[PDB]
Design a binder for this molecule. Structure first.
Ligand SMILES: Nc1ncnc2c1ncn2[C@@H]1O[C@H](COP(=O)(O)OP(=O)(O)O)[C@@H](O)[C@H]1O
Ligand SMILES: [Zn+2]
Lengths: 81, 283, 191, 252, 70, 51, 286, 73, 191
């Protein structure tokens, strides 16, 4: 198995540390975090070394084990939409 | 498991000024930013600073464009002595009062999911005037009972506004009292802001201009005295109700005479006293 | 694996004109700091290294940055001039790596002394004890060979790592025209 | 491409319009008096990063729907009627297609074209070039053909209108349209205004008549004050064609 | 405190106001104003307003909702 | 002075109450109703307050 | 050459916040940072600022460190957030000029050629403005010979936008006393001016005492300026000056007397009206 | 899903209007981030001015779901 | 002091120090703070302390708190209510009840709450013959408690007033001074 444990820092401060398969994709990681936080997956935004993680596998982005990630929620205001 | 109504959100002077300046800059839009602070106890949410973030949107919505900026800013503030982390977000409602809309509630839901006690602050720039600033702090109510427990009168001192009640106050979210605790240096700097240079106090005023102003005001007072004589003859041939509407669209010689007297007295007394003080101080 | 914030103290003095150590001591030291920065980066990807010169008084060129391209690029245009101020340079480096980006990192100073040091023994030992209290390691390279000995430097390093501290170092290189990178093997691996 | 179009459509759906108004006066730095075309007048703010020197008393402006803030300044509006006037298609008639009219072509050109190419001659002589011409004659002689030839072969802006088409049932709208047409000409100098069949609205002003007659005479008075009144026209020329020159106002 | 209150009542002078026309004064603290929307109203006058300036048929700004002479 | 200050403090919420239409009375009629022309709108058959 | 520097209140409060946070961290005495702003044809406007890492040895005036890499990064981010603001100078809360200030200014001149220093005393034991503005200039002497880089004073004042003014006035519910009349025209000046003049003269006296005793060497330029001051001190016993003073005072007192007469007549009118009202009310009640 | 969103946002009741103009607008200058508006700037295409049947004029920074070149005054 | 809470403690210490002394200096300070301070809590405490200071001459507390009760500041109005209550506890003062009656229907809920509690404190144990408004105030408390569209804090005050009016069964009274004329420390602290 060799789970890949990655630290997930949040701007607020809370740490949602979790371990994923070595082949886990960014979409899967976002889905797991959304399931944990009860937030739609489109709101959350994962970061890595000052670059947003768009989509694909985690490995080819340089995400190994013991790598720090940041979770920045989207901030939206308005009257509609 | 309580969340009490005596809880307060402490907004620093710097945070308040930054919020108001950004909101006024973005007058048609709901410009927005993050609030940094600490969760001291269950009766305090200290807001010590706020920083705006790159955002773009229309007059109907505003959204942030990059989270890399937020992360990097947090890091580079920690590196200079602000380890505080995000405790909420602020956005401006220009003229609609203070309340949260649906998109605002969704954003606050995300922030609550991240941290339980995160708060949202709505500052309305244009409705703010010199003496008072229109600002409020909010948090959501789950799908349940009473949202909070009352162990004091501190919560029930604000008389929530009709606009907020219409838009969902006490039904989808509740308010939190805002307090403006300050430190000694902040107090001293705020007091010193308006202090003028010492030389300005002793500086005199061109005597030609002073005499010209005195002459102009006395000449005006002459005509005002004529009109005052005319007006005094009235007030006996006037209905008790007619007197009030008598001074509508027409000059009031008594009021203008009093104002001119006050201005003349102040100016002349100040000038004479300054002249004597200088006469002694400077040899 | 070990986190380390290592500030490099390069010597752009007038004695670096000397061609005794390969194509000019300036270029020899350029290659040396190249290998040292690459070694630190390879040892830890998160490790951060900076650059300071020991010119007339001092000059900080690049504070701690994880990348090395900027440090190497700034290394160009380091034309020699003036004397060397070891105490002031090391104090400035101490301040710079006291104002770290990450406080869990360790603190290190790699100094290239390619010119005589005019600081007495008493001041250098005082600096040694202060740095020992502050928990700094000082790897000193006796480059240049203007004295190629314990030119008030072995006392410095021994005072640093006294009582089997084995934290500091003093690699003394002979004038042998061999690449300074080729010569350095103690601090890079057996630190 | 289909998904790009769908995304663009979804993005465009969530966009709100902006009220269009006119600036009447600037009270302070961040306070303007704006008159929405609907009729009401508001005191409104202005977006910060906006060149407020360009919000003169009369500039069209786009207002935010909610806060009524000034968000943009726009060029003067061109009525669809005036746009249609300017965008007529007189074929491609050339001066060779007109026969028997050489002196008349020469005179019409001297009035309209020559002052728009060689003003120096008129400046040297010391005369302001003439403005308007009246093409009158029996039917089928070539007045509209001459107008079409001028429009097709000349490079200035052209405005073709029918005096019968200028008229509107509501009170004052004919005069309003004449004013808009001449404002369009003034803005897009140089311009030629061709009022075909002028006798429809230009007729002798009677003393005894009807409400419709007086409305048409008001339209004619507006036209006359536009052609020669308190404001000179400069680089705007006029051509009018009529089969009945006798039944025209001496003022016209 | 009176000086403070005068400055705090000016938030009723928010920017998006409606221009009107002041027709007649009824009691003081009240008046009849003709809005540009085409309707007349019996509205209250703000206390801070200088009544010397309320000449007949003088331009005034009214609250968008309450239509109060502000 | 205190009364002046109190009035100026409640005036902010007193000024958000809706104005009143001004109409021209045509003729009284019926139990207590009146016929009024609310310009520019049409006429209405309105009541009368008890006072 | 700068004719005036306008420092907005947000800059001052941000400086105070920086000082407080670094002090809470501990072991520091002075704080340093950048002053973003804009130019208005020789009338500066300082609108925003950000902190910058800075340390110095309390003994050596040559061991100081400023993180210019961090300065550049934070300036890039601040530009990304607000383009209209560009680096204009640096600030430090040190009560008075230090000896490293010219070196720091030379460092900052590589980011702003006309850098302006603003010293903000966060603990002002005085009666005056909290900002002092200085600009680096080359000074050529006649006997001091070597041309050194010295700091030249520039007028500094505090201004504010509308939002900043509103916020400051809202926050100023600490001690509010407007009294724009003679009371304020007596406290904000007269007393304050005399106290400040006494402070400046006491500083000059302290320096002169030090020079006379021998702690400090003689400065010919300071002595020359003092000579000019003592020469400018006017003479108030001249007959012409006394006569002019009396004439102007008589005119001012004429105007004052007329104003007082108007006041008295108005007071009498009010008394008559009040008595009429009370008599009428008593009659009606009877 | 996007087509469903478009259909649900195209609720049937429309308001007829006439296209008064098809203006061309361009960005003016740099707009500070934090407060930048996608309409006043960052809009380089064609914008429409319309007059609703209710006698209300309007500026349309985004024309909508109908391509600009088709519309004429 | 700069902290409003510290200033409030200052007002409270003035009260406790000059408890039942009728000290003109203390009354002067309290009134100055009440009419000057910037913090409404401090104003409230300053107005409240007058009851402790003047509890030995109940006929005088109305003479100083009537105008404060009729004020523009609801906090000062509440302070006047509680000051009358503390000054005239267990006294059934006609002037105190007359001052409190208009305030029982004040616009502000906490002002109403304070008025109700003060009225209960004053009219403890008093009968119809002794005080001609006890029954009226009892009915007022019942009405406030029963109304289902009234403020929760007004209901809190009404319930507390019911409790205080009939205390210890009906066999207890509140008096800040013993029957011999000595200040009752337990009662002062309790109030
Ligand atoms: N002189 C002319 N030369 C050529 N064609 C002419 C001439 N006069 C009239 N026509 C014909 O008449 C038509 C246009 O009528 P025109 O004479 O221009 O207006 P009007 O009949 O009102 O004077 C054209 O189709 C053209 O063939
Ligand atoms: Zn919102």
């Amino acid at each position: 198995a060799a789970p890949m444990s990655l630290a997930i820092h949040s701007t607020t401060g809370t740490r949602y540390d979790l371990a994923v398969p070595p082949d886990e994709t960014v979409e899967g990681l976002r889905k797991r975090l959304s399931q944990r936080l009860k937030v739609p997956k489109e709101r959350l935004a994962l970061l890595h070394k000052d670059t947003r993680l768009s989509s694909g596998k985690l490995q080819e982005f340089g995400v190994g084990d013991g790598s720090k990630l940041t979770l920045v929620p989207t901030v939206e205001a308005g009257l509609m939409s | 498991p309580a969340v009490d109504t005596a809880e307060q959100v402490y907004i620093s002077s710097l945070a308040l000024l930054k919020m108001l300046k950004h909101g006024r800059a973005g007058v048609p839009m709901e410009v927005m930013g993050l609030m940094l602070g600490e969760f001291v106890d269950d009766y305090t949410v200290r807001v010590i600073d706020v920083f705006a973030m790159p955002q773009s949107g229309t007059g109907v919505s505003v959204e942030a464009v990059d989270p890399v900026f937020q992360a990097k800013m947090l890091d580079m503030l920690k590196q200079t002595g602000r380890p505080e982390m995000v405790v909420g977000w602020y956005h401006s409602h220009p003229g609609f009062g203070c309340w949260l809309s649906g998109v605002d509630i969704n954003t606050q839901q995300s922030f609550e999911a991240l941290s339980e006690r995160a708060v949202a602050v709505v500052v309305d720039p244009i409705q703010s005037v010199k003496g008072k600033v229109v600002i409020d702090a909010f948090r959501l109510i789950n799908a349940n009972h009473e949202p909070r427990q009352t162990t004091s009168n501190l919560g029930h001192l604000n008389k929530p506004s009709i606009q907020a009640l219409i838009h969902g106050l006490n039904r989808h979210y509740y308010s939190i009292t805002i307090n403006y605790r300050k430190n000694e240096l902040e107090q001293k700097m705020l007091l010193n802001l308006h202090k003028k240079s010492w030389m300005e106090g002793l500086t005199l005023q061109d005597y030609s201009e002073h005499c010209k102003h005195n002459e102009s005001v006395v000449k005006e007072m002459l005509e005002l005295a004529k009109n005052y004589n005319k007006a005094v003859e009235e007030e006996d041939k006037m209905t008790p109700e007619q007197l009030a509407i008598k001074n509508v669209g027409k000059q009031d010689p008594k009021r203008h005479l009093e104002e001119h007297v006050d201005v003349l007295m102040t100016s002349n007394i100040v000038q004479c006293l300054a002249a004597m003080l200088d006469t002694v101080v400077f040899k | 694996m070990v986190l380390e914030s290592t500030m490099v103290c390069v010597d752009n003095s007038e004695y670096m004109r000397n061609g005794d150590f390969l194509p000019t001591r300036l270029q020899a030291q350029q290659d040396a700091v190249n290998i040292v920065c690459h070694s630190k980066t390879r040892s830890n990807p998160e490790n951060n290294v900076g650059l300071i010169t020991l010119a007339n008084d001092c000059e900080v060129l690049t504070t701690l940055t994880p990348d090395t391209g900027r440090i190497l690029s700034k290394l160009h245009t380091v034309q020699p001039k003036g004397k060397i101020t070891f105490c002031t340079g090391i104090r400035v480096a101490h301040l710079a790596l006291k104002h770290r980006q990450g406080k869990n990192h360790k603190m290190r100073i790699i100094a290239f002394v390619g010119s005589p040091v005019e600081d007495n023994e008493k001041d250098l030992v005082k600096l040694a004890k202060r740095l020992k209290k502050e928990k700094v390691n000082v790897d000193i390279i006796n480059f240049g060979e203007e004295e190629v000995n314990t030119e008030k430097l072995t006392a410095f390093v021994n005072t640093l790592n006294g009582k089997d501290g084995t934290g500091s170092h003093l690699v003394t290189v002979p004038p042998g025209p061999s690449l300074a990178d080729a010569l350095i093997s103690s601090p890079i691996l057996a630190g | 491409k289909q998904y790009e179009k769908s995304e663009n459509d979804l993005k465009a759906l969530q966009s709100v319009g902006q009220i269009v108004g006119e600036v009447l006066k600037q009270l302070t730095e961040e306070k303007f008096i704006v008159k929405a075309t609907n009729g009401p007048r508001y005191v409104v703010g202005c977006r910060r990063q906006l060149d407020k020197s360009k919000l003169k008393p009369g500039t069209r402006v786009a207002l935010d729907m909610t806060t009524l803030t000034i968000m943009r300044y726009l060029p003067r509006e061109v009525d669809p009627l005036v746009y249609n006037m300017s965008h007529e298609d007189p074929g491609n008639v050339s001066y060779s297609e007109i026969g028997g009219l050489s002196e008349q072509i020469r005179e019409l050109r001297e009035v309209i074209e020559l002052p728009l190419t060689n003003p120096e001659l008129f400046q040297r002589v010391g005369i302001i070039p003439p403005k308007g011409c009246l093409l009158y004659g029996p039917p089928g002689t070539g007045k509209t053909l001459l107008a079409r030839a001028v429009a097709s072969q000349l490079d200035c802006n052209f405005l073709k209108v029918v005096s019968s088409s200028i008229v509107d049932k509501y009170i004052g709208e004919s005069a309003r349209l004449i004013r808009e047409m001449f404002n369009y000409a003034r803005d897009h100098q140089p311009c030629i205004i061709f009022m075909d069949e002028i006798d429809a609205i230009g007729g002798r002003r009677f003393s005894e008549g009807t409400s419709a007659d007086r409305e048409i005479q008001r339209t004619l008075m507006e036209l006359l004050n536009q052609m020669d009144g308190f404001d000179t026209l400069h680089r705007v020329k006029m051509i009018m064609a009529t089969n009945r020159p006798d039944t025209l106002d001496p003022a016209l | 405190e009176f000086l403070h209150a005068q400055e705090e009542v000016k938030r009723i002078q928010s920017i998006p106001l409606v221009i009107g026309q002041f027709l007649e004064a009824v009691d003081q603290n009240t008046a009849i104003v003709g809005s540009t929307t085409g309707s007349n109203y019996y509205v209250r006058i703000l206390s801070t307003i200088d009544r010397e300036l309320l000449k007949p048929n003088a331009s005034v700004a009214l609250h968008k909702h309450s239509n109060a002479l502000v | 002075l205190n009364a002046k200050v109190r009035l100026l403090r409640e005036e902010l919420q007193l000024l958000q109450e809706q104005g009143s239409y001004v109409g021209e009375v045509v003729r009284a009629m019926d139990k207590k109703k009146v016929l009024v022309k609310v310009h520019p709108e049409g006429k209405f058959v309105v009541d009368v307050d008890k006072n | 050459a700068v004719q005036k520097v306008v420092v907005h209140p947000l800059v001052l409060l941000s400086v105070v916040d920086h000082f407080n946070r670094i002090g809470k961290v501990g072991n520091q005495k002075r704080v340093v940072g950048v002053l973003l702003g804009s130019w208005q044809k020789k009338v500066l406007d300082v609108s925003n600022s950000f902190a910058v890492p800075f340390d110095e040895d309390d003994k050596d005036d040559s061991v100081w460190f400023l993180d210019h890499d961090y300065l550049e990064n934070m300036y890039g981010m601040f530009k990304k957030v607000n383009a209209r603001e560009r680096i204009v100078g640096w600030y430090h809360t040190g009560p008075k000029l230090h000896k490293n200030d010219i070196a720091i200014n030379e460092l900052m001149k590589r980011y702003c050629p006309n850098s302006v220093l603003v010293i903000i005393d966060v603990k002002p034991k005085d009666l005056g403005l909290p900002t002092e503005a200085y600009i680096s200039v080359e000074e050529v002497h006649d006997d001091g010979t070597p041309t050194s880089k010295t700091f030249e004073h520039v007028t500094s004042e505090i201004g504010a936008e509308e939002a900043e003014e509103v916020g400051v006035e809202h926050l100023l519910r600490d001690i509010k006393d407007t009294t724009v009349g003679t009371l304020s025209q007596r406290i904000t000046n007269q007393v304050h001016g005399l106290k400040g003049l006494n402070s400046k003269l006491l500083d000059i006296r302290s320096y002169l005492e030090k020079v006379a005793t021998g702690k400090l060497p003689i400065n010919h330029q300071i002595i020359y300026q003092l000579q000019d001051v003592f020469n400018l001190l006017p003479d108030v016993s001249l007959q012409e000056f006394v006569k002019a003073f009396y004439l102007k005072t008589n005119d001012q007192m004429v105007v004052v007397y007329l104003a007082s007469l108007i006041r008295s007549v108005v007071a009498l009118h009010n008394l008559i009206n009040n008595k009429i009202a009370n008599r009428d009310a008593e009659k009606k009640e009877g | 899903e996007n087509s469903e969103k478009i259909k649900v946002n195209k609720t049937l009741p429309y308001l007829v209007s006439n296209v008064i103009e098809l203006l061309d607008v361009d960005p003016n200058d740099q707009e500070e981030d934090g407060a930048n508006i996608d309409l006043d700037s960052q809009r380089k295409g064609k914008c429409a001015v319309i007059k609703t049947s209710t006698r209300q004029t309007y500026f349309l920074p985004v024309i909508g779901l109908v391509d600009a070149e088709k519309l004429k005054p | 002091d700069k902290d409003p809470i510290l200033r409030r403690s200052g007002m409270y210490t003035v009260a406790m120090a000059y408890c039942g002394s009728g000290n003109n200096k203390a009354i002067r300070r309290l009134l100055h703070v009440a009419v000057s301070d910037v913090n409404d809590d401090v104003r409230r405490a300053a107005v409240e302390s007058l009851g402790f200071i003047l509890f030995r001459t109940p006929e005088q507390c109305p003479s100083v708190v009537s105008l404060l009760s009729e004020s523009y500041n609801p906090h000062v109005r509440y302070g006047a209510a509680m000051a009358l209550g503390i000054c005239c506890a267990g006294t059934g003062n006609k002037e105190a009840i007359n001052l409190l009656e208009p305030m029982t229907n004040d616009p502000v809920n906490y002002v109403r709450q304070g008025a109700l509690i003060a009225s209960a404190l004053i009219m403890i144990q008093q009968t119809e013959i002794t005080c001609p408004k006890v029954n009226q105030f009892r009915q007022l408390y019942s009405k406030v408690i029963n109304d289902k569209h009234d403020d929760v804090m007004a209901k809190f005050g009404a319930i507390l007033a019911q409790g205080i009016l009939d205390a210890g069964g009906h066999n207890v009274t509140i008096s800040l001074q013993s029957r011999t004329g000595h200040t009752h420390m337990p009662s002062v602290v309790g109030v």
